[PDB]
Amino acid sequence: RMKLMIVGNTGKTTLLQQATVGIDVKDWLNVWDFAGREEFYSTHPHFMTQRALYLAVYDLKPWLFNIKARASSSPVILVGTPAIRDYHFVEKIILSERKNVPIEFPVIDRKRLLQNELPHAVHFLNESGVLLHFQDPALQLSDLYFVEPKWLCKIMAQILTVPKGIISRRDVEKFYMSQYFKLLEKFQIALPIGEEYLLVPSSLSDHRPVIELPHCENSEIIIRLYEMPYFPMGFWSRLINRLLEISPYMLSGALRPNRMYWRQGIYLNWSPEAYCLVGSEVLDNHPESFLKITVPSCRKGCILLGQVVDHIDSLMEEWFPGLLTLLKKWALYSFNDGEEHQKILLDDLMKKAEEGDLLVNIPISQIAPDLILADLPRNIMLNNDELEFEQAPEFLLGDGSFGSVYRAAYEGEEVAVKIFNHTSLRLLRQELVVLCHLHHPSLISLLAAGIRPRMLVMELASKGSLDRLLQQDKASLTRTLQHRIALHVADGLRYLHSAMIIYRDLKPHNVLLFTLYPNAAIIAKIADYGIAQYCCRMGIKTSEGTPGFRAPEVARGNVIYNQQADVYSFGLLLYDILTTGGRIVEGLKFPNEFDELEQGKLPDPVKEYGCAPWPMVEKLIKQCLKENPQERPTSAQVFDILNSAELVCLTRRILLPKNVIVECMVATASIWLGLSFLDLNTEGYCLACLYCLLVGCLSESNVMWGGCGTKIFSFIITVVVDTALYIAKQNSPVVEVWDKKTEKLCGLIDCVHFLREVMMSYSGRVKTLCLQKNTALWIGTGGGHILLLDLSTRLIRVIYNFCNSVRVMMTAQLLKNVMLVLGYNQSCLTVWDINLPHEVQNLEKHIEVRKELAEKMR
Ligand SMILES: C[C@@H]1CN(c2cc(-c3n[nH]c4ccc(OC5(C)CC5)cc34)ncn2)C[C@H](C)O1
Ligand SMILES: Nc1nc2c(ncn2[C@@H]2O[C@H](COP(=O)(O)OP(=O)(O)O)[C@@H](O)[C@H]2O)c(=O)[nH]1
Structure with missing residues (x-):
């Protein structure tokens, strides 16, 4: 019917009459008595849902952050010992079938044996306490239907109760098994670090060690403060997971550093001149929660300050909305390196960094090198004198997600300049994640990046975008060229996906053609990283993409999706490439219905648009336009399917x-x-x-x-005549070669070899x-x-x-x-x-x- 949840710190079970290791459930109303210990906090943001009444016991807060994150409207009641309402203190048939679960572990693969209905009926039941079907694409566990949800809550944090906080896989095993290790990681409970060890971010050392990190003077370190009112529910498990999976690729982009963990903070060090101490701090007389980031004040120590900052800022855009403002960013600085640090807001220091890169009562390049982009490679820095840029409608190229590509000339060359319209530095730096640190013959190449006008300078596509080719010049889309367009785009996705980056919007407008010569090495590139983000391993949650060019799991924003959302987008791009304009032309002539059929009721390309049939590509489109993201081939397999000459030449x-x-x-x-x-x-x-x-x-x-019998005549299955004489007999795995001039065998061809x-x-x-x-x-x-x-x-x-x-x-x-x-x-x-x-x-x-x-x- 309707379920109630009792949330709060240690000080719940006794109150339930009208030591809690788990989320044990004793339905009457369906209670969901939570665990007040700080160890279990990281794992049950997931179990808070909209259709629930929340009870709080403060006794005589991070809880309400995720209360008003899954559902703004919720009947929250408070008792003692942002929707406060009291301070008293002190599909129906399947429910019966799902109730009876006589199994060893209450998991069933499919309900077909036991029994638009299913997918919607389960969601309503999932919203109740009958069963838990997470069905999120990122978790890759939609094939498991967890009946008796009290089982899942109980034995999923038993790993952290049975040095201080590291456990090997064998110890857990020595206490239907591979799925258990997937559940542990996907809920940020026990994430792998080695081949046989599980980190278990929770229940690590409560107190940090004594670190004598080499640089202690004010002029040798850069400190970044991330003051928050409170740490959001399970914040450090998300951050530790993010930072130990990018660690080998944080300086080079594969150098594994020495790592330390104390459940709030992480210390990565490659050398005495290249380290990073991300960790929680507690300031006296301050009821706030900070996040200090200490890095050396050198060139190699500024590079990974903008890496950690980018990976922490992104980690709150997709996983902790609401802090973005509650969270304020400081930047510790000191003029003479003998005095105490002073802090200035990063937004306030950004204003002073927009007009001159000096701070007066020391350069900004040592206070916060990421606002002036002083940590990205020195060769991509804009020289504003060598830029002939006009910003006129006659020079407009396209409109990007947040900017507008204008034509310009930089260093004499004819280039394309993107101007961010009302925007922030984050948008410029979020797109800089892909433009640098990732170079590929199928990704647009960045030439310079400015901060004073806040522009990006990309190379110019010689022949424009693919969207104009499809809609204007249809005569030059030869079958051997529109294959290379798809091959190059699939190669771009393969590199982006292998580099932790999900691209999010893949449409013909973002596909740039540098030539129409079919045999050229570089034909197509993908541009515009406005919405590209890191998809670390936990997937992505925020939903972006143009309607009509996005995966079905992206249109519905309730699920958390993975990089497979780009394969569906590629399937539509290859659907459009095969059909030229086709659906897109009809799409602009029928708004609000372009995304209605993506769903996914795409008709047969040949049947409607009357294109020349292309087998092994129609098959590729069919298996890329799959509702289940797991059934879609990965971008490393889509390229492998396209990288075949039998696909091109089969008509x-x-x-x-x-x-x-x-x-x-x-x-x-x-x-x-x-x-x-x-x-x-x-x-x-x-x-x-x-x-x-x-x-x-x-x-x-x-x-x-x-040819007759076993002899050759002129004036045995087939006779082939050339400069030589090719012939094979019945059931002959070898083909003999003869010469007309000599009438003698001149070698044989064996197909078995x-x-x-x-x-x-x-x-x-x-x-x-x-x-x-x-x-x-x-x-x-x-x-x-x-x-x-x-x-x-x-x-x-x-x-x-x-x-x-x-x-x-x-x-x-x-x-x-x-x-x-x-x-x-x-x-x-x-x-x-x-x-x-x-x-x-x-x-x-x-x-x-x-x-x-x-x-x-x-
Ligand atoms: C027809 C005309 C149009 N043209 C272009 C160029 C581009 C282009 N180039 N480089 C870019 C880098 C980024 C970029 O971000 C997009 C995808 C957001 C629009 C576009 C371009 N995009 C359309 N058209 C080039 C000239 C010669 O030809
Ligand atoms: N004196 C007093 N003790 C209480 C009251 N309510 C709860 N307690 C104590 O709180 C304990 C219950 O802890 P509990 O909140 O269930 O632990 P948790 O579920 O793990 O967070 C019991 O042992 C009680 O002694 C109260 O109103 N008065």
């Missing part, structure tokens, strides 16, 4: 009816079958041994050859051959394997995973030559682009050239 995959078993076929665009008929345009369901009219193995290249090199499945029995003028030979093996071999050097690629046994191979004229192949599986009439042997080499060279470029930039 038609007509599927014949069941058990038709066609054995002969001839071309004419329509294809004949045998007697049947098939039209390529509408896909509507020996011939002209025979030759077109010799009647039988006949080929010519006017010299004509033939080629198949053996690639890691009775592999038939290898030759069933047909076909030759192409590009010194490449097509061999049809007994399985679903196709061998491409040079005619001169005598392997290109082995084509597989499209049928079960290739029957007949031939070349036809579609205005494009195609190598249409018929094979059994059910039988299918596969059609391949004749340039497949070339595209295997061109794409192989293209990846290697870009691979060298990626190492070159870093």
Whole structure:
């Protein structure tokens, strides 16, 4: 029905009559008596929900922060010993089925065996105390339906009750098991640090050690204060997890530092000149909570001051809204390095840093080097004299999330300048996370970054954005170019996702084209990091993205999502690339319905927009547009699917009816079958041994050859004629080569060896051959394997995973030559682009050239 929650410090269980290790539940009203110990605080922000009445026992506060974070409106009642209301002191059928849970551990994978209903019915039940289905994409545990929620609350913090605060996995195991270790980390209870050790941020040492960190003088350290009224519920578990997962990449961007933990604070040190002491502080006569950050006042010690500050500021934008103001940032400074530090508000010091980088009664570059961006590389600092920038509508390029890209020229080159409109330094520095520290041939390159006008200077895309290409010039979107656009964008996502960064808005407007030459090394780049954020391991919570270009789990802001939200965005981008304008053009002509169908009721691309069919990409779109984010392939797999020449050159995959078993076929665009008929345009369901009219193995290249029995005649399955003589017999895994001039065997070709090199499945029995003028030979093996071999050097690629046994191979004229192949599986009439042997080499060279470029930039 409706559930009640009793929250408060140690001083609850006794009050429940009308030592609490857990959130034990004794329903009458459904009570959720919490734990007052400070050790359990980090794990149960999650269990506070909207449909609950809150009771507080202060006895004779961080609790209300998350009370007014999951739901602003809540009937909070206070008793003794921001919605205060008292100071007295002292889907219905599934509920019955879910009540009975006769299992060992109360977890059920799916309700189908036990039993738009499910997904919504469970949420209402989840809002009650019947069961806990977290179903958040980040947690990756939506397949677990936790019945008897009192079990989950009880045995999930038993690790912290059974040096001071580190526990190994084996000790927990020595006390259906891998899911337990996932629950521990995903609730910020026991996060891994080593291969066999769990940190357990809670229940660490209560008091910090005695640290004699090398630099003690005022002129050798930089101190940053983060005064708060109180530490938000489970703040340090979030911060410690964030700081030990970025530690190897905090100076270089992989140097593992020496780390210390005391449950409020962390000490990272790479050297006596490169350390960082993030830790809580307690000032006398101050009822506040501080967060001191001490770093050395050197070049290598300023770099990771702006790293820690960026990772703490971001950690409150996505995880602790409300502190942003309750939280005020100070900056300790002292003129003579013998006196006591003095503090100035970081906002007040930002005003003095906008007009001259000096502070008068010492430079600002040592008080707070991150407001003047003095910690980012010295080569990306704006020289305002060499900037010819106008800010006129005639020079407007695009409108970014928070700025407006204008055209300008910097250092003589013609570049693009972004002006932040009303904004803060955080927006400039949040986008600076990706522009520097990450270099890739598929990410826009930053040339300079100013602070006085607060602009970014990116390189200029020669040919504009992809959105204009789709909507204006549709004639230049060749099939070999719009594949490279998707390949380059998928490579950009792969680097961003591998670098802890979720991009959030991937749309054609943010895809920049530097050339329309299909064979160039760099064609597409992704720009605009306005909403890119760190997705550390805990996912992201805040929801951003343009409607119609975002994942379904992003439109609904209640869940916390992960980097898989960009794969769905990529699936829509590749959906638009395949359909050119298509949905986007209709989207601007139908507002508030562009995101209505994303849901995800996207129609078939060929059926509606009438594009040229592209198999293995329509399949890729279908498996990227998955409602379940776990079913979507990762960005490292989307690139791997796109990085294949069989995907590019596969044109038609007509599927014949069941058990038709066609054995002969001839071309004419329509294809004949045998007697049947098939039209390529509408896909509507020996011939002209025979030759077109010799009647039988006949080929010519006017010299004509033939084959009968086990001998070759001129005036055994197939006869292939070239400068040499290629022929194979029935059930012959080897193809022999002959010479017309000598009438003698000149070597043999064995397909089994080629198949053996690639890691009775592999038939290898030759069933047909076909030759192409590009010194490449097509061999049809007994399985679903196709061998491409040079005619001169005598392997290109082995084509597989499209049928079960290739029957007949031939070349036809579609205005494009195609190598249409018929094979059994059910039988299918596969059609391949004749340039497949070339595209295997061109794409192989293209990846290697870009691979060298990626190492070159870093
Ligand atoms: C057609 C015209 C348009 N053009 C461009 C350039 C750009 C561009 N370049 N560099 C950028 C860096 C960032 C950037 O942030 C976006 C994606 C937020 C707009 C855009 C550009 N974006 C559109 N159009 C270049 C000229 C030659 O051609
Ligand atoms: N004298 C007195 N003691 C109380 C009162 N209410 C609770 N207590 C004491 O508080 C203890 C209950 O602790 P409790 O809040 O349940 O611990 P927690 O659930 O772990 O936070 C009992 O042992 C009582 O002795 C009261 O009104 N008067």
